[PDB]
Design a protein around this ligand. Structure first.
Ligand SMILES: Nc1ncnc2c1ncn2[C@@H]1O[C@H](COP(=O)(O)OP(=O)(O)OP(=O)(O)O)[C@@H](O)[C@H]1O
Ligand SMILES: Nc1ncnc2c1ncn2[C@@H]1O[C@H](COP(=O)(O)OP(=O)(O)OP(=O)(O)O)[C@@H](O)[C@H]1O
Ligand SMILES: Nc1ncnc2c1ncn2[C@@H]1O[C@H](COP(=O)(O)OP(=O)(O)OP(=O)(O)O)[C@@H](O)[C@H]1O
Ligand SMILES: [Mg+2]
Ligand SMILES: [Mg+2]
Ligand SMILES: [Mg+2]
Lengths: 441, 104, 401, 193, 398
DNA sequence: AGATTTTATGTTTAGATCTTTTATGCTTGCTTTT
DNA sequence: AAAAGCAAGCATAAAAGATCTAAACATAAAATCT
């Protein structure tokens, strides 16, 4: 069957685009132009700059940096006159780990095949002496410090004070480039380190606060591109792979759709996104979080469901994944509890409603439960030990949290709003009527 | 610097008008923004205001007790106001800020 | 074998070279005049003679020339807010003294220098001072012993040695042994050491140094005041030369709005470079005043109202309800439970439904990662505390106007 | 008699997920039972049916120290039947050592816990979850020494921890019965002068 | 992705939706993986066994390298990185060494290969709730290990908690949440009844009883017995392994009238309501010295009678704190014999503390200085039993 | 010219320290039942 | 009227929270034995 395999090619294409498109950048014209002209002036003119990408998580900061590096690196001038040192604040948790990584990535004489010799002090002295020994004739370094706010937390901010100071000095032309999500990262800096920082800052707020931009983004993310665009994209990716993410990138030349298939797919995508139901699902999704990582997660859950029996995306499929997104996940845990733990939570809700959210105890809740169990005519048979193990089963799900003493007398707090328990009372399967009457009063 | 003058005048005003000398950086910045708004001059953001108060701290006029967050840092004046008034050397401005009770 | 490389490094017999460019740097005559101003305005290009720091130059020069010619030794403490021309003036005085000693108008002298933030440990200064003498790298204990053998023992012909020490507050620690040794060595007659110490705080010897260390530091002191409205203009117009690429009102606005904040000179020399880069993309060859206004608005940024306006609608309802609970309860620290109740009230008013609390914790985590609010780890839901980091009037300014 | 029943329980697990485990309701007189557990190790080594670690409460203040003394006791006990540092005796090294030795033949990995009442509760529950995670790959048996009663075992083991427990109860004879036996057969014997 | 779900469905009845979602997200290895998946559910829901069978079938059928973990084992991050790279970089021997998170990312970056072979990696971390209690850079890196290593890997996480508990101050990357719902009564009956041939073979290997059982142990009989079992036991627990391990013993009691010649429900409903009281206890009287008994009931009166009532009872919320001298005073008041203060009596106090019959609610560091506070931790019925064996009527002093 | 303790050194983790802040407890000062 | 009972008040102290430091542990330079 040919129709069974074109859908597999479409699904692998859309999944590979949603997951591995590390250099494509929609939007940010002037900001990308600022970052590109700044790195270009550092590589050519020997200026020592510094920059600080800023913005909410999920906006394309790493994608912007990868786009600028992917368009600058194959120039055979930026690639020959500039060495690039990535650093990350989650992996380089101490100054000496980041310093050994700097010594390796710059290929200094004391590195020797990835095992740096000498102490942290000797590594800092050799790095600063190599940087002081250079000049405009030396190669430009481009430091890229992702998670810069964690680099601010290091002792004395000492590595930061070095990395800025070379940028303030007539030494090697380096370009420090922090990338961080906090909008007030600059007040974390020490006043000396803040003085040596050049205060230019690039904010990357997403450009799709309007809903129509969100619908256009969801349409462009699902449509199959024209084949000449696949040729130009594969040409650019081959140019960045002849010279890091390039070992496992998109490579869109592996997939080549027929014009009738691309036309039928883009027709079905425009017809689905013209519907009021898909627009209502995207409206709720845009109302929660506008960031592109959220939409790509929703679209990956949508594209993953394209079985050969059902090739087409439809508005009911987007409504099903959107109903999967919006549901409360603590009510779905409360519905899985057995009737004894549900009676314990109802006794906890009664003790909280009566005493105005005072902290409870296993003894108080067991007494309030036994006052119902003596007349329940189905709960007479339970032992105190079974109710105690049910209370511990409530405690390990973090539906009950300790105030931070014997395990039967420790004070506790309910972790639920009353509306969540009230919706559990309606969503519960095969609830006995005695518990449903006791819950009302 | 003029912003350091406005910060010292708002700190003297909040220390004079209030029995509780537990002044945070955010509680001081919220009054400093209203004082700059009534003076019809542009106010610094909190990220620059923290560096301004840190630069005033080097003179010994203040002492900042650090906390978990930059908003929660506690400014503590270490000069008396009779010295702060002679140090600012702009009595026509301090007479305007200290008579501005309504902006607190 | 690597050990021969490390031994040649620790003995100093191989200089630490850095890789050279494959392509030659561009010639000076191909540069535009605006590029010439952009490279004269770089902060790394120290002038040969600093404008507006003549009095401090005479002070440090008279102190160092008297300490060198008298062959006695001593100490000095210069201090001031960053960017005020401290280290540039001290190195300019020392370069002038070296130019004078080269012509035999002055006795010759050695010039050691350290910096307290280039050292991982306070004791590593012993490793570095000895590295400016012999060039060998040794352990700090052997280096301290050899430095005591050099300074305590009179060995003619001993030459005068000037030990500049930037960043004195990093060298302190609790024991204060390193700063005590560095200030105690000049007091011995055998050592001709003249130590100069640069720092930021004016009150450092009384604030954190010990009483004997403050007694050794002495009463000779100098304070670098912040640059005023006029000195910052003289600095930038000295950097530009005779070029008219900057308007005089543009430099006046840069100096007027930088001197009002800090008095840093690096801020003025960075804002003028950004103004040159802004004028370059407009294809004009003179930096007119609105380019300076755009560069000033960019580099004294205040982008939190843009962040609140760019938030998703449920996050804006959350930011309204946190300030609503702050106004209602009075205290500035609110639990998530009352914030969620005010969220349900505001969402019932606006007509949109709100996400259930497990998604409201995701909204609170996003605002706490963006630092629009301060919030705890999410493991203690409904009882986590939510400080508002942005001011309450900024939220209404974002969501009304 | 209780020794033969415990050895038959360990060999029956060896003939064959939850970890099999055997509560031993021993008396209040805790020091006396070290000879009992030593006789159990002697029988299990003489049959070549198992290798035994013994986890004292003094050695296990934290989960790290408990895992280190457990792996060190199993490896050094096997070395003493026929010295790595305690920093490196990870459970991964225990799995690699068991695969290098006894995968070709299955020896049980008995872990005596003589003073069950003296343990930290969180360390003991985390250790039971760790030993339950390795069942199938590593055959564990967890005999215990409960000086009080089985209600203490049901109290200190929560719903999650007791979900992975298949315990069997053995009972040591009462201390007054042992005193009466010693007083009648020894101190009243005709043969002593 | 079809063969894996076809091979897992017979092992896992009533999980066709979860197996279908797992085989859509991380089934085929040629297709790119989501960066992280978080499936969650209650105890007994079958997530550890499901991810183990799924990782085993994907590793046998395809090119993937699987790595299963228990995060309780990883008290330090170096243990987790060494086990993760022992599984994802096979046959490295004892030469394997990982210093920190950076070395793990670099050595996983070395494992990337050509796209023709379509390799994949998979990491399951059971007990993922412990990941938020450790180094606070393990969880954010694990949620973007695919972007960091440039490598086709998904990091599955397994916990009893929703992902709303897992957010930190710095935020987190996106994750594909998945919910394993616990079964209703009908699906639980189908799951308990899915092992019918095993119990039928177990009875047929265990001789008139053999033919009278094999002619009457057919599928409707086991289904009706499981209906009679779940009519009483589903109220206390929905936990499937506990229902299995109790239902086998209850069938062993239930089967006797059929072997010995409705008409069954009352004979089992005797024992069935006895097994209901022994639920969660997984089983297949505290003798004391005399003066230890008096010390224990005196500690119970000290923790139960409050400080003010001793003056009226002895001159002749929770359990209360009591100092050791208050315990000795109540012990001498109730003893009515007056033994001396030997070493053995205070040794009995300390060894009652060591057995968790008493407790140290405070003090601890200064037991001898008199600042120590003890708290009795036993129930009233054990005290009444001790007072029966002793002959001291405790209820007079309460 | 190569293997072995030997020693000197650097790192890391557990413990001492500084500082805030919060609390039970030690004492006080009335306070009130028997 | 006598002695048990509730607010008040400073105080050792207890958590804690950052912070600095001393000793245990991993590791490299090197005399030493072959
Ligand atoms: N402007 C954009 N153009 C293209 N893709 C984008 C853009 N913004 C976000 N994305 C998508 O969002 C997802 C995450 O983006 P990205 O990795 O750039 O965020 P990030 O900058 O790493 O955030 P953080 O650094 O805070 O984790 C990516 O899959 C990327 O495809
Ligand atoms: N009076 C001046 N004239 C010309 N240029 C100046 C003047 N003052 C400062 N600069 C420029 O600003 C920079 C200030 O550097 P300098 O080392 O003097 O700062 P600093 O006061 O030592 O800072 P910190 O105290 O943070 O170390 C110099 O590189 C110089 O180019
Ligand atoms: N749908 C099912 N069909 C058959 N057996 C099941 C099913 N669900 C669970 N089980 C059984 O449950 C047993 C163990 O469950 P498992 O340990 O996977 O639960 P868990 O979620 O890991 O528990 P915990 O969260 O407490 O670790 C397995 O032996 C398995 O046979
Ligand atoms: Mg990123
Ligand atoms: Mg300086
Ligand atoms: Mg499990």
């Amino acid at each position: 069957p040919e129709a069974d395999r074109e859908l597999v090619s479409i699904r692998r294409f859309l999944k590979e685009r949603l997951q591995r498109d590390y250099t494509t950048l929609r939007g940010y014209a002037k900001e990308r132009s600022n970052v590109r002209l700044l790195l270009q002036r550092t590589a050519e003119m020997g200026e020592s700059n510094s920059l600080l990408l800023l913005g909410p998580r999920g906006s394309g900061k790493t994608t912007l940096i990868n786009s600028v590096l992917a368009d600058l690196l194959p120039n055979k001038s930026f690639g020959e006159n500039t060495l690039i040192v990535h650093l990350d604040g989650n992996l380089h948790t101490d100054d000496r780990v980041a310093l050994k990584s700097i010594t390796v990535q710059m290929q200094l004489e004391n590195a020797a095949d990835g095992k740096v010799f000498g102490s942290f002090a000797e590594n800092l002295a050799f790095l600063l002496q190599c940087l002081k020994a250079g000049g405009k004739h030396s190669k430009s370094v481009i430091f890229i410090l992702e998670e810069f706010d964690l680099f601010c937390a290091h002792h004395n901010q000492t590595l930061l004070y070095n990395l800025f100071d070379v940028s303030q000095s007539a030494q090697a032309p380096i370009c420090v480039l922090g990338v961080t999500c906090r909008l007030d990262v600059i007040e974390l800096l020490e006043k000396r380190v803040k003085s040596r920082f050049s205060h230019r800052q690039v904010f990357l707020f997403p450009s799709l606060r309007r809903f129509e931009d969100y619908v256009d983004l969801c349409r462009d993310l699902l449509s199959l591109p024209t084949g000449n665009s696949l040729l130009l994209a594969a040409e650019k990716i081959y140019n960045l792979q002849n010279i890091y993410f390039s070992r496992n990138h998109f490579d869109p030349g592996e997939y080549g759709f027929s014009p009738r298939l691309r036309d039928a797919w883009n027709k079905q995508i425009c017809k689905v996104l013209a519907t009021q139901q898909a627009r209502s699902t995207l409206q709720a999704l845009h109302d929660f979080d506008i960031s592109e990582a959220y939409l790509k997660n929703f679209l990956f859950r949508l594209v993953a469901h394209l079985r050969p029996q059902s090739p087409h995306i439809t508005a009911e499929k987007m409504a099903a994944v959107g109903s999967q997104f919006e549901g409360d996940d603590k009510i779905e845990l409360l519905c899985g509890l057995s009737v004894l733990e549900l009676c314990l939570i109802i006794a906890i809700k009664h003790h909280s409603q009566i005493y105005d959210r005072d902290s409870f105890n296993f003894e108080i809740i067991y007494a309030r439960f036994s006052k119902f169990a003596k007349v329940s005519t189905t709960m007479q048979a339970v032992e105190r030990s079974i109710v105690l193990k049910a209370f511990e089963h409530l405690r390990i799900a973090e539906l009950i949290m300790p105030l931070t003493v014997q395990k039967e007398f420790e004070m506790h707090k309910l972790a639920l709003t009353y509306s969540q328990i009230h919706h559990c009372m309606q969503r519960y399967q095969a609830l006995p009527t005695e518990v449903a009457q006791w819950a009302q009063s | 610097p003029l912003q350091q003058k406005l910060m010292l005048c708002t700190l003297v005003l909040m220390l004079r008008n209030e029995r509780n000398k537990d002044i945070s950086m955010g509680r001081l910045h919220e009054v400093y923004r209203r004082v700059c708004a009534k003076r019809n001059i542009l106010a610094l953001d909190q990220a620059e205001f923290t560096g301004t108060v840190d630069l005033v701290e080097t003179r010994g006029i203040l002492r900042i007790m650090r906390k978990k967050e930059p908003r929660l840092h506690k400014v503590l004046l270490q000069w008396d106001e009779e010295e702060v008034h002679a140090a600012l050397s702009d009595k026509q401005l301090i007479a305007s800020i200290l008579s501005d009770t309504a902006c607190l | 074998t690597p050990s021969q490389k490390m031994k040649k490094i620790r003995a100093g017999e191989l200089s630490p070279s850095m890789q050279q460019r494959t392509d030659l740097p561009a010639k000076d005559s191909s540069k535009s005049e605006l590029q010439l101003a952009r490279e004269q305005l770089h902060v790394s290009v120290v002038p040969k003679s600093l404008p507006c720091r003549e009095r401090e130059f005479e002070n440090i020069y008279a102190f160092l020339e008297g300490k060198i010619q008298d062959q006695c030794g001593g100490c000095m403490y210069v201090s001031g807010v960053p960017g005020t021309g401290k280290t540039a003036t001290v190195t300019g005085v020392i370069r002038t003294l070296q130019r004078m000693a080269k012509q035999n108008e002055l006795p010759a002298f050695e010039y050691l220098e350290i910096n307290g933030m280039r050292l991982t440990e306070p004791r590593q200064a012993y490793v570095q001072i000895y590295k400016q003498l012999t060039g060998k790298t040794v352990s700090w204990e052997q280096a301290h012993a050899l430095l005591e053998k050099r300074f305590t023992t009179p060995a003619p012909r001993r030459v005068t040695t000037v030990l500049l020490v930037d960043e004195l507050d990093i060298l302190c620690n609790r024991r204060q042994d390193v700063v005590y040794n560095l200030l105690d060595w000049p007091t011995k007659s055998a050592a001709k050491l003249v130590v100069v110490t640069i720092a930021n705080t004016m009150d450092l010897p009384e604030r954190l140094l010990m009483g004997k260390v403050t007694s050794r530091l002495g009463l000779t002191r100098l304070t670098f005041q912040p640059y005023s409205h006029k000195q910052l203009q003289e600095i930038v117009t000295a950097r530009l030369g005779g070029s008219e690429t900057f308007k005089g009102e543009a430099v006046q606005l840069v100096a007027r709005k930088v001197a009002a904040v800090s008095g840093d000179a690096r801020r003025a020399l960075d804002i003028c470079r950004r103004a040159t880069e802004i004028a370059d993309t407009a294809a004009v060859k003179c930096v007119t005043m609105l380019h300076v206004q755009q560069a000033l608005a960019e580099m004294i940024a205040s982008a939190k109202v843009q962040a609140i306006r760019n938030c998703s609608r449920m996050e804006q309802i959350f930011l309204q309800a946190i300030a609503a609970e702050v106004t209602r309860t009075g205290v500035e620290e609110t639990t998530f439970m009352g914030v969620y109740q005010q969220v349900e009230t505001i969402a019932a008013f606006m007509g949109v439904t709100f996400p259930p609390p497990g998604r409201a914790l995701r909204l609170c985590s996003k605002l706490g990662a963006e630092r629009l609010i301060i919030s705890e780890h999410s493991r203690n839901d409904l009882f986590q505390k939510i400080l508002l980091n942005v001011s309450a009037d900024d939220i209404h300014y974002a969501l009304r106007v | 008699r209780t020794l033969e029943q415990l050895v038959d329980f360990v060999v029956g697990q060896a003939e064959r997920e939850v970890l099999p485990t055997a509560a031993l309701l021993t008396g209040i007189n805790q020091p006396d039972h070290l000879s009992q557990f030593t006789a159990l190790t002697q029988r299990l080594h003489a049959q070549r049916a198992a290798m035994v670690c013994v986890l004292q409460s003094r050695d296990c203040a934290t989960l790290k120290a408990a895992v280190e003394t457990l792996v060190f006791g199993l490896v050094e006990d096997n070395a003493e039947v026929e010295r790595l540092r305690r920093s490196q005796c990870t459970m991964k090294q225990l799995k690699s050592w068991y695969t290098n030795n006894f995968d070709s033949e299955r020896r049980q990995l008995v872990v005596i816990l003589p003073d069950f009442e003296c343990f930290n509760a969180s360390v003991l529950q985390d250790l039971i979850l760790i030993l339950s995670a390795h069942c199938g790959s590593l055959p564990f048996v967890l005999v215990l020494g409960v000086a009080t009663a089985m209600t203490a075992v049901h109290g200190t083991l929560p719903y999650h921890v007791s979900s992975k427990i298949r315990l069997r109860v053995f009972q040591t004879q009462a201390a007054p019965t042992g005193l009466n036996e010693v007083l009648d057969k020894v101190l009243l014997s005709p043969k002593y002068a | 992705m079809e063969a894996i779900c076809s091979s897992l469905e017979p092992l896992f009845p009533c999980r066709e939706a979860a197996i279908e979602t797992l085989g859509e997200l991380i089934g085929d290895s040629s297709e790119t993986y989501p960066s992280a998946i978080y499936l969650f559910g209650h105890s007994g829901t079958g997530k550890t066994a499901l991810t183990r069978a799924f990782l085993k079938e994907c590793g046998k059928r395809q090119n993937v390298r699987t790595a299963h973990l228990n995060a309780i084992e990883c008290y330090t991050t170096k243990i987790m990185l060494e086990i993760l790279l022992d599984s994802l970089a096979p046959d490295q021997g004892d030469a394997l060494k990982v210093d920190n998170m950076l070395d793990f990312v670099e050595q996983l970056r070395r494992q990337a290969a050509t796209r023709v072979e379509d390799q994949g990696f998979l990491i399951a971390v059971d007990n993922a709730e412990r990941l938020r209690d450790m180094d606070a850079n393990v969880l954010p890196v694990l949620l973007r290990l695919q972007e960091l290593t440039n490598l086709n890997l998904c990091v599955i996480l397994l916990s009893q908690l929703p992902f709303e508990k897992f957010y930190n101050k710095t935020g987190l990357s996106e994750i594909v949440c998945l919910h394993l719902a616990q079964y209703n009564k009908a699906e639980t009956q189908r799951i308990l009844g899915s092992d019918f041939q095993q119990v039928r073979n177990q009875l047929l290997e265990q001789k008139k009883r053999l033919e009278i059982c094999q002619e009457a142990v057919t599928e409707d009989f086991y289904n009706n017995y499981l209906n009679l079992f779940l009519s009483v036991f589903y109220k206390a627990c929905r936990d499937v392994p506990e229902l299995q391990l109790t239902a086998r013993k209850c069938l062993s009691t239930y089967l006797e009238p059929v072997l010995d010649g409705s008409r069954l429900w009352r004979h089992i409903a005797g024992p069935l309501r006895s097994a209901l009281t022994q639920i969660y206890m997984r089983i297949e009287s505290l003798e004391l010295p005399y003066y230890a008994k008096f010390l224990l009931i005196a500690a119970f009166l000290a923790s139960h009678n409050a400080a003010k009532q001793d003056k009226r009872l002895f001159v002749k919320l929770g359990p209360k704190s009591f100092s050791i001298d208050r315990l000795l005073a109540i012990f001498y008041a109730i003893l009515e014999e007056k033994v001396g203060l030997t070493c053995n009596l205070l040794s009995q106090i300390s060894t009652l503390v060591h057995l968790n019959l008493l407790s140290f609610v405070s003090g601890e560091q200064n037991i001898m200085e008199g600042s120590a506070r003890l708290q009795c931790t036993i129930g009233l019925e054990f005290v009444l039993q001790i007072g029966k064996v002793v002959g001291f009527n405790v209820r007079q002093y309460l």
